[PDB]
Amino acid sequence: QDCPGEGEQCDVEFNPCCPPLTCIPGDPYGICYII
């Protein structure tokens, strides 16, 4: 699959942040932020 990068939109359906990034807010949609 093709996962998003840092600074992209991540949804709680099938498009989450696979690399070392988190989904914020992510309720339901979020963004891939670095922590």
Q: Break the chain down into helix, strand, coil percent, rounded to 5.
A: 0, 35, 65
Yes or no: say if 22 and 1 are a contact pair by the CB < 8 Å rule: no
Q: Is 3 left (phi over 0), alpha (psi -120 to 50) or beta?
A: beta
Experimental technique, in short, is NMR
Phi/psi at 33 (5° precision): -105, 155
Yes or no: say if 21 and 6 are a contact pair by the CB < 8 Å rule: yes
